[PDB]
Amino acid sequence: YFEISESSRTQWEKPQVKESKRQFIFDVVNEGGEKEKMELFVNFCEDT
Amino acid sequence: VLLTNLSEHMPNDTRLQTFLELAESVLNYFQPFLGRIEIMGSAKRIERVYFEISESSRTQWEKPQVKESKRQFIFDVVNEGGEKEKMELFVNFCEDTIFEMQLAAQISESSILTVRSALFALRYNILTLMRMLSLKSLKKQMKKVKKMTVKDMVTAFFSSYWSIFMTLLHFVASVFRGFFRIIC
Amino acid sequence: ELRDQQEQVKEDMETKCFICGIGNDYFDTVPHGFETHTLQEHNLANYLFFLMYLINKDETEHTGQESYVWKMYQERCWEFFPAGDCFRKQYEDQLN
Amino acid sequence: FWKKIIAYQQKLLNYFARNFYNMRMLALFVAFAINFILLFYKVSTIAVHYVLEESSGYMEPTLRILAILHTVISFFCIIGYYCLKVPLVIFKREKEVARKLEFDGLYITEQPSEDDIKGQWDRLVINTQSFPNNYWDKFVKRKVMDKYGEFYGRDRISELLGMDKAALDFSDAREKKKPKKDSSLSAVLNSIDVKYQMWKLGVVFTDNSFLYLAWYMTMSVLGHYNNFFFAAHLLDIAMGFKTLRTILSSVTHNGKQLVLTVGLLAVVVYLYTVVAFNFFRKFYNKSEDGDTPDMKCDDMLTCYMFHMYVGVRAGGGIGDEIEDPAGDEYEIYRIIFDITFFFFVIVILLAIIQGLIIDAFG
Amino acid sequence: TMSVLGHYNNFFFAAHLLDIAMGFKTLRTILSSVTHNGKQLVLTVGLLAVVVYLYTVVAFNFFRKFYNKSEDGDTPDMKCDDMLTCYMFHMYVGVRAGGGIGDEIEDPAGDEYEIYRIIFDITFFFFVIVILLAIIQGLIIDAFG
Ligand SMILES: Nc1ncnc2c1ncn2[C@@H]1O[C@H](COP(=O)(O)OP(=O)(O)OP(=O)(O)O)[C@@H](O)[C@H]1O
Ligand SMILES: O=c1[nH]c(=O)c2nc[nH]c2[nH]1
Ligand SMILES: [Ca+2]
Ligand SMILES: [Zn+2]
């Protein structure tokens, strides 16, 4: 359990972040390895 | 081989690690040559067998005709194959491939331009942008805007971005010219 | 149908090992499990190299396993090949 | 002064970055309006004026204002993209190169393959002073020095990374510092790393979306010279919509198979052209009046062109356009020729190309 | 309403004939196969209109001498003189031709735009007839299936 700031949640809900999330979700599901999945996810996390 | 066999058959004993991390280098050198398989042992268990693979034989395996034969056989057995007949077709292919590699040793007795043109255009077209920005007219522009002027003030970066786009166009034209040069 | 058969051949190659026939997921439980199994544990060319090594080696210098494989090879008995089993499955409880 | 100018510049850059998408949308709206205005376009009577006809009369100024507004909003959209998405691409590239340098030493131990244009372009940024500007870890050079210094040469890797030896010890220790003044411009010009923005503009140019937007720029600026270049902006709806992009990418999807299939279609038609040119030439007269025969299979290039065009897009084969063979000793041979043409070229390889594309879409 | 209008004009009783398509199950399946992929179908016919409009623009700019459609040469029909008429002639007659617009458009032999017209019309046949039309048909039939 941790603290999520409301400003950070609004930044998450901003539209460009949503579009990036949609694109990344499509990419990893369409092409993805079991080892490479969790690495692409953390790379996307840093980019986001 | 003895060290690898011990490491595999005893994967938890920490004392054998000392030997392993003392002997990476021997194991790393012998890694390509060591061959590892699993078989139905006489005691009805899986047994890992270690043998020697000669580098000349590996090169014979990597020769192109053997690769093509392997591709054809792999397609054939997978497309049509019986569980009993699979393992027989595999060994027949193995014998044929052994003969083929023996024959291969006998018979064999003992983009970049397009990349470079694009790189040159990228170098000395953005170098052109740097040359025409090296005039260093910022002090003259501050003489012009001695008190704030929103219009004179925005037109500066507007022209800058317009010039960035025009340099992009010059780059596209340079890439087209380089590709035309390469093709003819 | 011909193109789909080619794709199915490639798909089966990538999803199941040639010799043992165990599904790729069982090895892929650990990272690179299928790659390790199909490159070192159950490599296709390794059996070819082993058969050649047996042919070149003198029968007098054959080990127990080598003599066993040689004997059932000239008896045309392919039971020595693993069938739905591997070293990891055989000693899974002992290994991990 | 300079504080005020920087503040106003940054505020307006944020304005464009915030309003990137709305302007992206209004640009397409203006592109639609311009095409709708152009739809009522005339030619006037050699005097050939491309004249805009109006029942109302005031459409021509409206079209001029719409073209000017489209170009202005398009430039503003490029500014918005440059201030909104470019930092993310730079961050991704500068993280990838940093991790390749640290984990693998792709520019220290093992050099790139020389075919990775991104790799050769990032060879230039490894010695830039202002490195991880966007990346968070501003000590990647310090870490790669500790990792690969003693084996591959302390000084050699240092000068490969373009890092000075003087600052190392007294960075951890106590030393003098240098503040900055906004009015002082020589320091600003020195701090603007010609090599760093060199590499940055290289990356931006290699980016695909910026290329798309600059093509959009170019089409607008050419639309000023000729009003009809605004019709290429109409395809931007096919880029905006998801299923339209799916349809467009359905062609590139099976690119290799599609190219090879049309090549085989060309080859088979070339064999048919060879056969017709050798034997079946009397049947290829294509003149309504017999006085001047068109005789379009006299030249092989022309006959192959007539089997490429007209022949393939006929719906029944070449025999529809070629005259009837009744009463000739090659009657049966021509029947076989054309029936095989219909089966192999029309029924087959054309349904194959169509099936490839539609199956890729599906 | 259709019945009460059928009293005024006897021919309005023919719309009641579609009620069998509402009664039968598979007929309703066929009718609903069109609405099923409504969004994709509308966007595909819109793209078909767009591509044909680009072809109309190209023909109106360059390929206009070839669009005379008069049997007697004394009074040329000249149906690509106006862009609306030429787009209408590429919408109708052009799409429903079976071989493309080049069937109705006159032969280009002996002209310096011969190769350019060949490319124009061959691309029309591939992109408009072979493609997006089989696509619309496939969308509808696949929805039914
Ligand atoms: N018994 C097996 N031996 C080798 N590869 C196997 C085996 N079973 C499955 N495979 C899979 O087949 C692939 C390697 O063999 P294959 O010849 O099919 O492909 P490849 O990578 O093109 O081979 P090559 O080394 O000839 O280039 C890998 O994806 C591997 O996981
Ligand atoms: O220490 C850090 N680790 C990270 O991954 C990171 N990403 C942004 N900023 C960061 N800082
Ligand atoms: Ca012995
Ligand atoms: Zn196996």
Short mmCIF file of C-alpha atoms in Angstrom, two decimals, chain B residues 15-179:
data_model
loop_
_atom_site.label_atom_id
_atom_site.label_comp_id
_atom_site.label_asym_id
_atom_site.label_seq_id
_atom_site.Cartn_x
_atom_site.Cartn_y
_atom_site.Cartn_z
CA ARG B 15 31.17 -26.30 -2.89
CA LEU B 16 31.13 -27.20 -6.60
CA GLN B 17 30.42 -23.56 -7.43
CA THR B 18 33.93 -22.60 -6.27
CA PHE B 19 35.31 -24.89 -8.98
CA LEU B 20 32.81 -23.63 -11.57
CA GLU B 21 33.50 -19.91 -11.07
CA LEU B 22 37.18 -20.81 -10.95
CA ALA B 23 36.87 -22.60 -14.31
CA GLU B 24 34.59 -20.44 -16.46
CA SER B 25 37.37 -20.12 -19.03
CA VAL B 26 37.87 -23.83 -19.72
CA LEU B 27 34.11 -24.36 -19.82
CA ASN B 28 33.65 -21.30 -22.04
CA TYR B 29 36.29 -22.57 -24.47
CA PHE B 30 34.85 -26.09 -24.58
CA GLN B 31 31.20 -24.94 -24.77
CA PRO B 32 30.92 -25.06 -28.61
CA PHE B 33 32.53 -28.51 -28.76
CA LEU B 34 30.52 -30.14 -25.96
CA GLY B 35 27.41 -31.96 -27.15
CA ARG B 36 24.42 -32.58 -24.89
CA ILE B 37 21.51 -34.99 -25.44
CA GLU B 38 18.96 -36.95 -23.40
CA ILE B 39 18.11 -40.63 -23.90
CA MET B 40 15.95 -43.43 -22.50
CA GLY B 41 18.45 -45.09 -20.18
CA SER B 42 18.60 -48.80 -19.47
CA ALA B 43 17.21 -47.97 -16.01
CA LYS B 44 14.21 -46.26 -17.68
CA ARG B 45 15.35 -42.74 -16.77
CA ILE B 46 16.55 -39.65 -18.61
CA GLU B 47 20.34 -39.57 -18.88
CA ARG B 48 22.31 -36.60 -20.22
CA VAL B 49 25.13 -37.74 -22.51
CA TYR B 50 28.17 -35.58 -23.27
CA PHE B 51 30.37 -36.06 -26.34
CA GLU B 52 32.80 -34.17 -28.57
CA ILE B 53 31.63 -32.20 -31.62
CA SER B 54 34.43 -31.37 -34.05
CA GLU B 55 34.60 -27.85 -35.45
CA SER B 56 35.05 -29.17 -38.99
CA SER B 57 31.86 -31.21 -38.60
CA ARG B 58 30.03 -28.13 -37.30
CA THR B 59 31.16 -26.15 -40.36
CA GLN B 60 29.97 -29.00 -42.60
CA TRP B 61 26.63 -28.75 -40.80
CA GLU B 62 26.54 -24.98 -41.38
CA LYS B 63 27.26 -25.34 -45.11
CA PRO B 64 24.28 -24.16 -47.19
CA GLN B 65 23.18 -27.37 -48.93
CA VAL B 66 22.94 -29.19 -45.59
CA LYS B 67 20.82 -26.29 -44.31
CA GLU B 68 18.48 -26.57 -47.30
CA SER B 69 18.18 -30.33 -46.86
CA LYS B 70 17.41 -29.82 -43.16
CA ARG B 71 14.69 -27.28 -44.00
CA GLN B 72 13.11 -29.61 -46.55
CA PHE B 73 13.17 -32.62 -44.20
CA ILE B 74 11.78 -30.56 -41.31
CA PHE B 75 8.89 -29.38 -43.47
CA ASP B 76 8.20 -32.89 -44.78
CA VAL B 77 8.11 -34.71 -41.43
CA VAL B 78 5.96 -32.05 -39.75
CA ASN B 79 3.49 -31.85 -42.63
CA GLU B 80 3.22 -35.65 -42.97
CA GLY B 81 4.46 -37.81 -40.10
CA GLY B 82 3.50 -40.72 -37.85
CA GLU B 83 4.59 -41.00 -34.23
CA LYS B 84 6.41 -44.25 -34.98
CA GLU B 85 7.48 -43.11 -38.45
CA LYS B 86 8.71 -39.72 -37.19
CA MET B 87 11.69 -41.13 -35.34
CA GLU B 88 12.58 -43.38 -38.30
CA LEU B 89 12.42 -40.58 -40.86
CA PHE B 90 14.60 -38.52 -38.52
CA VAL B 91 17.32 -41.19 -38.38
CA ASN B 92 17.15 -41.76 -42.15
CA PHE B 93 17.64 -38.01 -42.62
CA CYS B 94 20.50 -38.21 -40.11
CA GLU B 95 22.30 -40.85 -42.16
CA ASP B 96 21.71 -38.92 -45.39
CA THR B 97 23.02 -35.73 -43.76
CA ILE B 98 26.10 -37.55 -42.47
CA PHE B 99 26.84 -38.71 -46.02
CA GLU B 100 26.16 -35.19 -47.32
CA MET B 101 28.60 -33.61 -44.85
CA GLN B 102 31.23 -36.25 -45.72
CA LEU B 103 30.80 -35.32 -49.39
CA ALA B 104 30.94 -31.59 -48.58
CA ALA B 105 34.35 -31.90 -46.92
CA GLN B 106 35.60 -33.76 -49.99
CA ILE B 107 34.26 -31.22 -52.50
CA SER B 108 35.45 -28.20 -50.48
CA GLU B 109 39.14 -29.02 -50.27
CA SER B 110 41.54 -26.64 -48.54
CA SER B 111 22.46 -0.50 -48.60
CA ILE B 112 25.68 0.95 -47.19
CA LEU B 113 25.81 3.59 -49.94
CA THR B 114 22.21 4.60 -49.20
CA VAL B 115 23.07 4.80 -45.49
CA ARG B 116 26.18 6.91 -46.09
CA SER B 117 24.42 9.33 -48.45
CA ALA B 118 21.65 9.90 -45.90
CA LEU B 119 24.26 10.42 -43.18
CA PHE B 120 26.13 12.98 -45.32
CA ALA B 121 22.89 14.86 -46.02
CA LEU B 122 21.99 14.83 -42.32
CA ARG B 123 25.47 16.08 -41.43
CA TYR B 124 25.87 18.95 -43.89
CA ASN B 125 22.32 20.13 -44.11
CA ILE B 126 21.83 20.68 -40.40
CA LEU B 127 25.37 22.05 -40.60
CA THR B 128 23.81 24.53 -43.04
CA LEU B 129 21.19 25.38 -40.40
CA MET B 130 24.03 25.91 -37.92
CA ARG B 131 25.92 28.10 -40.42
CA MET B 132 22.93 30.36 -41.05
CA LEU B 133 22.23 30.54 -37.30
CA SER B 134 25.92 31.26 -36.60
CA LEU B 135 25.42 34.86 -37.74
CA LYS B 136 24.61 35.57 -34.06
CA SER B 137 22.06 38.33 -34.64
CA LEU B 138 20.49 38.01 -31.18
CA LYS B 139 22.07 41.28 -30.02
CA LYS B 140 20.77 43.05 -33.14
CA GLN B 141 17.32 41.57 -32.50
CA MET B 142 17.48 42.92 -28.94
CA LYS B 143 18.42 46.33 -30.35
CA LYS B 144 15.31 46.01 -32.53
CA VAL B 145 13.15 45.00 -29.56
CA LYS B 146 14.35 47.62 -27.07
CA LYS B 147 10.97 47.61 -25.35
CA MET B 148 8.67 44.59 -25.57
CA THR B 149 7.10 43.90 -28.96
CA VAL B 150 4.91 40.80 -29.10
CA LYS B 151 4.85 40.77 -32.91
CA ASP B 152 8.57 41.32 -33.55
CA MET B 153 9.10 38.91 -30.68
CA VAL B 154 7.06 35.98 -32.02
CA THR B 155 8.16 36.45 -35.65
CA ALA B 156 11.71 35.50 -34.63
CA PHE B 157 10.95 31.95 -33.51
CA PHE B 158 8.27 31.66 -36.20
CA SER B 159 10.96 32.24 -38.82
CA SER B 160 13.27 29.88 -36.91
CA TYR B 161 10.75 27.01 -37.04
CA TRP B 162 9.91 27.81 -40.67
CA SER B 163 13.63 27.54 -41.45
CA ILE B 164 13.82 24.24 -39.55
CA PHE B 165 11.07 22.89 -41.81
CA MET B 166 12.78 24.27 -44.92
CA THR B 167 15.97 22.49 -43.85
CA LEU B 168 13.92 19.31 -43.53
CA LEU B 169 12.75 19.86 -47.12
CA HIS B 170 16.33 20.41 -48.26
CA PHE B 171 17.22 17.15 -46.52
CA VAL B 172 14.43 15.26 -48.30
CA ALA B 173 15.58 16.71 -51.63
CA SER B 174 19.19 15.76 -50.82
CA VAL B 175 18.15 12.18 -50.00
CA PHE B 176 16.22 11.97 -53.28
CA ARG B 177 19.26 13.30 -55.16
CA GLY B 178 21.56 10.82 -53.41
CA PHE B 179 19.24 7.90 -54.17
#
